[PDB]
Amino acid sequence: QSRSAKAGLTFPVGRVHRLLRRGNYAQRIGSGAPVYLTAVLEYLAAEILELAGNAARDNKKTRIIPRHLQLAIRNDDELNKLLGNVTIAQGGVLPNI
Amino acid sequence: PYTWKFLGISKQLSLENGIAKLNQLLNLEVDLDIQTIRVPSDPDGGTAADEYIRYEMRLDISNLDEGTYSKFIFLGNSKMEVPMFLCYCGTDNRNEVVLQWLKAEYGVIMWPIKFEQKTMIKLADASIVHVTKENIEQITWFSSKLYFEPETQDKNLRQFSIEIPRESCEGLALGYGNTMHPYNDAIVPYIYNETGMAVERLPLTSVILAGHTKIMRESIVTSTRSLRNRVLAVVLQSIQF
Amino acid sequence: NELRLEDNYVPTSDTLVVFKQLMKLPVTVLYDLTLSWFAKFGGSFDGDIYLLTETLDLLIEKGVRRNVIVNRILYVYWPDGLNVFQLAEIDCHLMISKPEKFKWLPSKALRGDGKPYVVKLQPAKFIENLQTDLAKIYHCHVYMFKHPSLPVLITRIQLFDSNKPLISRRPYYVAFPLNSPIIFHSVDKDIYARLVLQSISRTISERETIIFKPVQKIPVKSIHNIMTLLGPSRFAESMGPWECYASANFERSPLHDYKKHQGLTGKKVMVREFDDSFLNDGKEEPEIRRLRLEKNMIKFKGSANGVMSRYSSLVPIEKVGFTLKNEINSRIITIKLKFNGNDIFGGLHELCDKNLINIDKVPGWLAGENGSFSGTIMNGDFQREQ
Amino acid sequence: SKARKETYSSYIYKVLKQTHPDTGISQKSMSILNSFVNDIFERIATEASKLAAYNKKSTISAREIQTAVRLILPGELAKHAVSEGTRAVTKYSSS
């Protein structure tokens, strides 16, 4: 039984704990910080994956592409503003209309 | 197949003292046998050292019940250190009730009988030799085989055997000549003579004759009706110091 | 006659038995087979090779228990069943991993009256002729693989029955050395043992009659050991005390330097008493003790250092039974010796160290000479059992 | 022979299969998702460290992480993120 198994988070917990310890962000690390950060990361990943999947549904193709990832990110205005400075490789550009 | 349990005696005792008082504790009749014979250690002549006294009786009424049959055979001397020993066969309460009765009667205490290689082989010599009614000694031969169980690590060699057809036994004693101890001069040296192994030094488990006896150190097994006299005598000298 | 089986047939083998076969194989070899398995016949996984090798790599990263991946390849990747080629692969990989668990029996090939026939096996031609000779009767599927560190060519033959899916029988293994009349085959006494072995003799000959004669009757495990025992090697016919001749290390080349020649240096020896002083017996000198212990090793290992703890011999054997016959006074005296254990000649060596057995009077056959062969001895000559 | 690549690939794949099993992933998309997750984690960790160092706070705790994620993620996603994170931490404490 793993701490991730108790937490219900697909992303591991001790992984984030050791990453936080390694990165010398603070002199002393806590215990709820890894689980909270893991939960936030899992929520964000699930959200972006679900939006990309919905874009794929509208794309009637079983294969998802960075093209579709750029579709989802730029079509969601909030996500676009959050990720304004990043550039997606082979993402293309949005149609005018 | 009858298994014989061997057992020794510390000091010489008298057994015919009270056959009337050995029965009421047991509630059935037990008979008595008084017997003594010559045991020639040397065919040329025998001193007074072979003077042996033997007792024998049983504890039974039912001849049909062959399984519940036991005999107590006594034999021994009175001039050397250990006077005598005893042997019995079968498992029953009758094999011990008298045994306590002389537990607290004479003060003699018992001990298991130990056999080693110096004794084990020579028993078959007394087993194969025969005596007729005219005091003529002829040997009835048997195809002896030996069991060896050497203690070793990795169990590399855990058990091996040597078998001799006894027509070849015949060819060995005749080559040596007329001998009273065939296993001293025809058989045991010949194994060392050819293969170079010492039978006595090696750990010996069993010596088996062809359907006559079954010799093992823990207990002797024989299919005969009753044990002979030379066997008991050689056992007596072997357990003597 | 399309009774032969392709590499895509799926027999209805039980899930439990194939579960136990993957039990013994290590984790690192399961990853290798799965990648190769998908590249040949594919699988039920909805992904490409790159996707498959990615997730499988992650099971290694997490330290995933082997029961999970074994269940994964049995209930996710191939829930329907296991291919015959996959079964052959797992069988051969188990053969390589545990070579001590399989027993072998030797057999000799003869042509004409008594001329031994050395076998020259073509990996291709030997297959189709056997298939033709076997499919006329029963369903047949064969697989060949070469030993990674040995020159043998192990061939496994499995036969199927109709009682509708086919029912697999116990496989028959036949090992072919490169160039040797001796052929090692597995142990079997069924309808298929005499049908497979007989078909091989007709197939490999192709121009003249070839018969198979069993050299021995007692099987020996450790396919590595049987090659040294009976296969093509220098150690054959020079075992026991004569193992120093198999590896010519005691003699230097004629072009080599002659000061290192042992003629100048000589050898250190001790005098052996020809008069019998072994029966009766003082503490031995440590130097005398060392030399006495060296005599025992010379007559069981062949050299002071040993060709090969120290009591283990070059090739362990289980059961050897000798028979000694000599003529004394115009009649034959017979003595029969039977030995049983793990290393018979290793065990005799230890008893000689404990002074139980005289080392001077032990014969050659008891010392390990012509080992693994049991037979009658007369006039100082050893005859193998017919 | 190669030091293992430290990724979130198995967990991302598991999340996708939990959502819906029919589709798959391409390698370029996998790298994109890995980079995005790493960047978000680095941002949040740096923010928490800086915020803790500001109040001469030697340790990093759930309150600091929640404030950092509120700072980084915009409020619309931040509400759901903090709600789910609080749920997870409380249930972990209960366990």
Q: Between chains, do C61 and D4 touch, taking CB under 8 Å as contact? A: yes
Residue D81 contacts A where some CB pair is shorter than 8 Å: yes
Range of the domain at B39: 1-241
Residue C51 contacts D where some CB pair is shorter than 8 Å: yes
Backbone phi, psi, residue A2, to 5°: -95, 155
The Cα A44–Cα D72 span in angstroms is 13
**Cβ pair C127, C144 in contact under 8 A:** yes
Whether D contacts A, i.e. 3 or more CB pairs less than 8 A apart, is yes
**Cβ pair C222, C99 in contact under 8 A:** yes
Q: Between chains, do C346 and B157 touch, taking CB under 8 Å as contact? A: yes
- Residue in C337, C347, C361 nearest the CB of B152: C347
The Cα A94–Cα B16 span in angstroms is 126
For tokens 């005969």, the residue is B224
**Cβ pair C93, C26 in contact under 8 A:** no
Residue A81 contacts D where some CB pair is shorter than 8 Å: yes
Q: Between chains, do B158 and C340 touch, taking CB under 8 Å as contact? A: yes
Query: What is the crossing angle of helices A32-58 and D9-19, to 10°?
Result: 50
Chains linked to C by 3 or more Cβ pairs within 8 Å: B, D
Residue D32 contacts A where some CB pair is shorter than 8 Å: yes
Using CB atoms within 10 Å of the CB of residue B26, give its burial: 0 to 12 exposed, 13 to 18 middle, 19+ buried: middle
Q: Between chains, do C329 and B159 touch, taking CB under 8 Å as contact? A: no
Q: Between chains, do D32 and A88 touch, taking CB under 8 Å as contact? A: yes
The Cα D44–Cα A37 span in angstroms is 8
For C352, left (φ over 0), alpha (ψ -120 to 50), or beta?
alpha
All domains of chain A in start order, with CATH? 1-86 (1.10.20.10)
Quickly count: other Cβ atoms within 10 Å of residue D35's Cβ. 13
Structural domain count, chain B: 1
User: How many beta-carbon pairs under 8 angstroms link C with D?
Assistant: 16
Q: Between chains, do B154 and C331 touch, taking CB under 8 Å as contact? A: no
Q: A6 contacts in D (CB within 8 Å)?
A: 92, 95
- Identify the closest residue of chain C to B165 by CA–CA distance: C334
- Residue in D13, D21, D27 nearest the CB of C55: D13
Q: Between chains, do D9 and C46 touch, taking CB under 8 Å as contact? A: no
Structural domain count, chain D: 1
Q: C60 contacts in D (CB within 8 Å)?
A: 4
Q: HEC states along D23-78? A: CCCCHHHHHHHHHHHHHHHHHHHHHHHHHHHHCCCCECCHHHHHHHHHHHCCHHHH
- Residues 17 to 56 of A: which have CB under 8 A from any D CB? 19-20, 23, 25-30, 32-33, 35-37, 39-50, 52-53, 56
The Cα D9–Cα D6 span in angstroms is 9
Q: Between chains, do D27 and C46 touch, taking CB under 8 Å as contact? A: no
Experimental method: cryo-EM
Range of the domain at D27: 1-95
Residue A74 contacts D where some CB pair is shorter than 8 Å: no
| CATH code where residue D34 lies | 1.10.20.10
The Cα B149–Cα B155 span in angstroms is 10
DSSP β-bridge partners for residue B55: B34, B74
What is the nearest CA distance from D29 to chain A, expressed in angstroms? 6
Documented resolution in Å = 3.7
